[PDB]
Amino acid sequence: GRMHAPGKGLSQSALPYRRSVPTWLKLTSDDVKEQIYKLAKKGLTPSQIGVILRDSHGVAQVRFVTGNKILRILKSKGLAPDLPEDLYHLIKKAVAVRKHLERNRKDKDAKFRLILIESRIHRLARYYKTKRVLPPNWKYESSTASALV
Amino acid sequence: SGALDVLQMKEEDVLKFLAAGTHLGGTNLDFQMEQYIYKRKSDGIYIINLKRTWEKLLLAARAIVAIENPADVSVISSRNTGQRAVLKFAAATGATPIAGRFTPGTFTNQIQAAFREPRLLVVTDPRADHQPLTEASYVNLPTIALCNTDSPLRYVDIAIPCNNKGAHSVGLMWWMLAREVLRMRGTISREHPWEVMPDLYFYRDPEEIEKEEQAA
Amino acid sequence: PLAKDLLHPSPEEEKRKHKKKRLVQSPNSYFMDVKCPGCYKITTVFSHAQTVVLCVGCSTVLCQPTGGKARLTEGCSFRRKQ
Amino acid sequence: IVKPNGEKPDEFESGISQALLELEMNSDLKAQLRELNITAAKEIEVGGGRKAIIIFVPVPQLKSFQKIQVRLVRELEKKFSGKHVVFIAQRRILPKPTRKSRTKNKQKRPRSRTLTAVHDAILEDLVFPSEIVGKRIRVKLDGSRLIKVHLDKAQQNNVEHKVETFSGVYKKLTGKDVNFEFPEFQ
Amino acid sequence: MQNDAGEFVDLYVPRKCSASNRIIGAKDHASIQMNVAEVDKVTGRFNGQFKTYAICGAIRRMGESDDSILRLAKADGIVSKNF
Amino acid sequence: VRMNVLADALKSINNAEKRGKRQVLIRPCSKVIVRFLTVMMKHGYIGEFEIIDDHRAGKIVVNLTGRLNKCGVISPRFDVQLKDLEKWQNNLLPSRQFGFIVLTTSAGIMDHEEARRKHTGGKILGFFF
RNA sequence: UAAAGUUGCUGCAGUUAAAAAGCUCGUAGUUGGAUCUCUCUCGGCCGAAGCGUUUACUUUGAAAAAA
Ligand SMILES: [Mg+2]
Ligand SMILES: [Mg+2]
Ligand SMILES: [Mg+2]
Ligand SMILES: [Mg+2]
Ligand SMILES: [Mg+2]
Ligand SMILES: [Mg+2]
Ligand SMILES: [Mg+2]
Ligand SMILES: [Mg+2]
Ligand SMILES: [Mg+2]
Ligand SMILES: [Mg+2]
Ligand SMILES: [Mg+2]
Ligand SMILES: [Mg+2]
Ligand SMILES: [Mg+2]
């Protein structure tokens, strides 16, 4: 089930059994990598890049074509954000909730949701510290959060 | 029928089934009566596969013939539509008929007047003859039933997927079962049609009796 | 009930189950070749697209996303791939 | 065209290299075979009298080989007497690390250098004209195993006659028993 | 069943259900021992030989004796393969 | 969350055995599960089984013969010395004429009698009879 | 002390007989999805030296006062 909700949904993606690139796809690995670089320079997260490639260019799975994931390709090129995208989104949502809450003191539900979001942020930050993706002094503080993202 | 050509279903039997409407089921389907169904058409009516019905009827006939004493087979009908068919089946085959009400304790209460010890049981409807079915479980009695699309199969060993609602269908099923039993016994032959017609097993419907009485 | 071949489900049995509950997972989606009447270019479109797909040559809206699938613009033709 | 790792060629390798030179000279695929090369070759007996040729080619050229695979196989089968010719890549096997293992563990073993990965790659490349859509493993009552491989239906007619030679080649190389089937559809 | 000397030491050997292989006890009164007649392939009359099936009461209460009998008859060739 | 795969597989097998089913589907697969099933099959309790290979953790379809009374797992996996095996046999087995305790030893995964023959101990996985 | 499976690790209970925190978050603790089949040199095949990424486990052996 959900980490912070009672829901127990099952909606997700199921990749096909075959790992071979389809015959109709005319794109090569280098062309896909160039498209990825152009989209990243445009300012798109890897998830958006994958969505665009799936919807428009018929690229079902970049890892099947180029043999590598989007984030690793960006890191090899050097066009990678300092902090991971999911943590960035969590911090941005926490900032938005905190900005809403300061003008609405009686919204206890906003306080509850902010507590949940900050707990998830702490979990993700500790995990990323364990993998050394973040320095072992990075801290999430409410005041610093606005400047962080 | 072990794929034998002699035991295959003929065209006239198919015509009789189509005329009697035995292939027409109910709107409800039992989850254990789904292997004998063919397809659900519009208006919710389920259609029964007649080949599987023929296979089940032949298996029931084989089960009946294996009993040495013909009197050890009991045929029971509670509804009025099946009483005449059961009586004719018993007369033609030599079984013991129970038409009308079944007295509880017939198979268990050994001091009653109607106490009996049948070796095989044939019923017309599991949902209407449930009382004889339940008492079978007490005395090790195998059971044969004429089931429908919506019919419980508890304590039923050989289920014949026919239409047990209409009088014509019930009479035809009983007549065909009797014919198959007699042919397997070696009494009548498979080379010529049986002398008795299947209309002798149908329900009289005393309205029809009154109509025929005033015909002349 | 008490007698069922799990190794060999029928083809209709496996298209009625949930995509995850099958013996081997298989998506219900597909890619298609679409063509608008104005312009001759053929565009590859994912069935469950989430973005508006524009024709590169002539800037024609090929499809609009919805909750389940993306609906093609009127007059546009499509054919499944493989 | 033959560049063995051990630098020691044989008679069959020489003959196959001569055939490849003949195909370079007398066919339209000059540049491809000029750039490409093979590592080794072998012959086995399968199917109660049939013979199968196995062409071990380097891994960095397997993808380029797959471009001409069908035409090259046809030309080889026409040049040689009735046989069955299959192209397989050259995969290295690294032993599993152990407590008593020596400085051969100075680098972590790549997952590609694994017995299971190599066997899967060999099986995938063995039947190249047809894709693999499913795999089943049956454990017999005596403990033995049997591998059933499902192949694509669209390429059934191309490799339907080579199934037995595939089962022979895999048994000779991997040492396991494998069978091939063509399911109806999904 | 038997001792080290090999002599069999039991009152009786109970029969097992043909459908589920379960033991049919002495007090199981819902069990059935049914016989299905065999016919001659040429004439179709009663051969005089029959095949015996035994079903325990647990299966019958589940309403699974019909399918079990059908499968047993199909395996023995009594029921047509294209049933 | 799921923390033991052998426990789930054995529970599924036992539940399907109680209901009189002919085949059981167990997922996910594991080589420990395959070893346990092989040990059970060598003694004739289950029969042949087939491993369906999807690209994620696999599945197993097991045929049943109706000879299995109880198959179960012991958690946590306790260390068993060769001199403490008789106590586990008394506690877990129904009789001294049948039933097997399954152990994982340094030689491999086997039953208690085969571990007595090879004079080795290990960790208890489960039992079946 | 056993009886006491009425202190329950083996091995107890918690709808109505005694009993589950008003609800949620959360550190420590506990638990955690699949997957990977001896070595050169120096000395007389063995001797020295490095072993083992290390453990846990199991099986040996040695040392372990009598009463
Ligand atoms: Mg939680
Ligand atoms: Mg979702
Ligand atoms: Mg005490
Ligand atoms: Mg005690
Ligand atoms: Mg007390
Ligand atoms: Mg106890
Ligand atoms: Mg108490
Ligand atoms: Mg109370
Ligand atoms: Mg409460
Ligand atoms: Mg914690
Ligand atoms: Mg694990
Ligand atoms: Mg001492
Ligand atoms: Mg002492």
Curated annotation (Swiss-Prot), chain A:
GO terms for biological process: cytoplasmic translation; negative regulation of RNA splicing; ribosomal small subunit biogenesis; translation. The modification Phosphotyrosine is found at residue 37. GO terms for molecular function: mRNA 5'-UTR binding; mRNA binding; RNA binding; small ribosomal subunit rRNA binding; structural constituent of ribosome. The modification N6-succinyllysine is found at residues 26, 33. It is found in: Cytoplasm; Nucleus, Nucleolus. The modification Phosphoserine is found at residue 29. Belongs to the universal ribosomal protein uS15 family. This is Small ribosomal subunit protein uS15. It comes from Homo sapiens.
Swiss-Prot record, chain C:
It comes from Homo sapiens. Its cofactor is Zn(2+). Component of the small ribosomal subunit. The ribosome is a large ribonucleoprotein complex responsible for the synthesis of proteins in the cell. Required for proper rRNA processing and maturation of 18S rRNAs. Part of the small subunit (SSU) processome, first precursor of the small eukaryotic ribosomal subunit. The keyword Ribonucleoprotein applies. Zn(2+) binds at residues 36, 39, 55, 58. This is Small ribosomal subunit protein eS27. Keywords: Cytoplasm, Diamond-Blackfan anemia, Metal-binding, Nucleus, Phosphoprotein, Ribonucleoprotein, Ribosomal protein, Zinc, Zinc-finger. It is linked to Diamond-Blackfan anemia 17: A form of Diamond-Blackfan anemia, a congenital non-regenerative hypoplastic anemia that usually presents early in infancy. Diamond-Blackfan anemia is characterized by a moderate to severe macrocytic anemia, erythroblastopenia, and an increased risk of malignancy. 30 to 40% of Diamond-Blackfan anemia patients present with short stature and congenital anomalies, the most frequent being craniofacial (Pierre-Robin syndrome and cleft palate), thumb and urogenital anomalies. The keyword ATP-binding does not apply.
From Swiss-Prot, chain D:
Keywords: Acetylation, Cytoplasm, Cytoskeleton, Diamond-Blackfan anemia, Isopeptide bond, Nucleus, Ribonucleoprotein, Ribosomal protein, Ubl conjugation. Its main location: cytoplasm. The keyword Nucleus applies. The modification N6-acetyllysine is found at residue 67. It is found in: Cytoplasm, Cytoskeleton, Microtubule organizing center, Centrosome; Cytoplasm; Nucleus, Nucleolus. It is linked to Diamond-Blackfan anemia 8: A form of Diamond-Blackfan anemia, a congenital non-regenerative hypoplastic anemia that usually presents early in infancy. Diamond-Blackfan anemia is characterized by a moderate to severe macrocytic anemia, erythroblastopenia, and an increased risk of malignancy. 30 to 40% of Diamond-Blackfan anemia patients present with short stature and congenital anomalies, the most frequent being craniofacial (Pierre-Robin syndrome and cleft palate), thumb and urogenital anomalies. Component of the small ribosomal subunit. Part of the small subunit (SSU) processome, composed of more than 70 proteins and the RNA chaperone small nucleolar RNA (snoRNA) U3. Binds IPO9 with high affinity. Interacts with NEK6. Interacts with DESI2. Interacts with IPO5, IPO7 and KPNB1; these interactions may be involved in RPS7 nuclear import for the assembly of ribosomal subunits. This is Small ribosomal subunit protein eS7. It comes from Homo sapiens.
Curated annotation (Swiss-Prot), chain F:
PROSITE patterns: RIBOSOMAL_S8. GO terms for molecular function: RNA binding; structural constituent of ribosome. The modification N6-succinyllysine is found at residue 87. InterPro entries: Ribosomal_uS8, Ribosomal_uS8_CS, Ribosomal_uS8_sf. GO terms for cellular component: cytoplasm; cytosol; cytosolic ribosome; cytosolic small ribosomal subunit; extracellular exosome; membrane; nucleolus; nucleoplasm. Component of the 40S ribosomal subunit. Part of the small subunit (SSU) processome, composed of more than 70 proteins and the RNA chaperone small nucleolar RNA (snoRNA) U3. It is linked to Diamond-Blackfan anemia 20: A form of Diamond-Blackfan anemia, a congenital non-regenerative hypoplastic anemia that usually presents early in infancy. Diamond-Blackfan anemia is characterized by a moderate to severe macrocytic anemia, erythroblastopenia, and an increased risk of malignancy. 30 to 40% of Diamond-Blackfan anemia patients present with short stature and congenital anomalies, the most frequent being craniofacial (Pierre-Robin syndrome and cleft palate), thumb and urogenital anomalies. DBA20 inheritance is autosomal dominant. This is Small ribosomal subunit protein uS8. The gene is RPS15A.
